[PDB]
């Protein structure tokens, strides 16, 4: 068995086709097992309709999830990614550092 804590990166990307589109991304990488809970948050609020949850694996025991959705960030909110994984005794919340 192997378990690997996800690396969690939260970042925004504008698809080059539409600069006004902005995706909040939670890239959860390298984890195993694949069981995982990933949410994008705005303040504590789960962003419900995350358009993309792209899971892949490299090696059988390394999973990668790009969990991203269009958003329109306000300065008035914090955006984060919350990951639960067995390796994470507490939900890991990684804030988007937009600047």
Curated annotation (Swiss-Prot):
Lineage top rank: taxon: Eukaryota
GO CC list: cytosol; early endosome lumen; early endosome membrane; endoplasmic reticulum; endoplasmic reticulum lumen; ER to Golgi transport vesicle membrane; external side of plasma membrane; extracellular exosome
Protein's UniProt keywords contain Secreted: yes
Post-translational modification: Glycation of Ile-2 is observed in long-term hemodialysis patients.
Annotated keywords: Amyloid, Amyloidosis, Disease variant, Disulfide bond, Glycation, Glycoprotein, Immunity, Immunoglobulin domain, MHC I, Pyrrolidone carboxylic acid, Secreted, Signal
Residues of this chain annotated as glycosylated in UniProt: 2, 20, 42, 49, 59, 92, 95
GO terms under biological process: amyloid fibril formation; antigen processing and presentation of endogenous peptide antigen via MHC class I; antigen processing and presentation of exogenous peptide antigen via MHC class II; antigen processing and presentation of exogenous protein antigen via MHC class Ib, TAP-dependent; cellular response to iron ion; cellular response to iron(III) ion; cellular response to nicotine; intracellular iron ion homeostasis
Glycoprotein among keywords: yes
Domain Ig-like C1-type: 6-94
Pyrrolidone carboxylic acid modified-residue sites: 3
Subcellular location: Secreted; Cell surface
Cysteine disulfide partners in this protein: 26-81
GO molecular function: identical protein binding; MHC class II protein complex binding; peptide antigen binding; protein homodimerization activity; structural molecule activity
Role summary: Component of the class I major histocompatibility complex (MHC). Involved in the presentation of peptide antigens to the immune system. Exogenously applied M.tuberculosis EsxA or EsxA-EsxB (or EsxA expressed in host) binds B2M and decreases its export to the cell surface (total protein levels do not change), probably leading to defects in class I antigen presentation.
Annotated family: Belongs to the beta-2-microglobulin family.
Quaternary structure and interacting proteins, as annotated: Heterodimer of an alpha chain and a beta chain. Beta-2-microglobulin is the beta-chain of major histocompatibility complex class I molecules. Polymers of beta 2-microglobulin can be found in tissues from patients on long-term hemodialysis. B2M alone (not in complex with HLA-I) interacts with M.tuberculosis EsxA (ESAT-6) and an EsxA-EsxB (CFP-10) complex; the tripartite complex can be detected in the host endoplasmic reticulum. The B2M-EsxA complex can be detected in patients with pleural tuberculosis and is stable from pH 4.0 to 8.0 and in the presence of 2M NaCl.
Clinical note on disease: Immunodeficiency 43: A disorder characterized by marked reduction in serum concentrations of immunoglobulins and albumin, and hypoproteinemia due to hypercatabolism. Patients may suffer from recurrent respiratory tract infections and severe skin disease. Amyloidosis, hereditary systemic 6: A form of hereditary systemic amyloidosis, a disorder characterized by amyloid deposition in multiple tissues resulting in a wide clinical spectrum. AMYLD6 is mainly characterized by gastrointestinal and cardiac symptoms. Neurologic involvement, sicca syndrome, and carpal tunnel syndrome may also be present. Inheritance is autosomal dominant.
Name listed for the protein in its UniProt record: Beta-2-microglobulin
Location of this fragment in the whole protein: 21 to 118 of 119
């Amino acid at each position: 068995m192997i378990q690997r804590t996800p690396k969690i990166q939260v970042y925004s990307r504008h698809p080059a086709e539409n600069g006004k589109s902005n995706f909040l991304n939670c890239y959860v990488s390298g984890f195993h097992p694949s069981d995982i809970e990933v949410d994008l948050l705005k303040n504590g609020e789960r962003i419900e309709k995350v358009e993309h949850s792209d899971l892949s694996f490299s090696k059988d025991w390394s999973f990668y999830l790009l969990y991203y959705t269009e958003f329109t960030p306000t300065e008035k909110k914090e955006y984060a990614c919350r990951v639960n994984h067995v390796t994470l005794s507490q939900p890991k919340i990684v804030k988007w550092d937009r600047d």
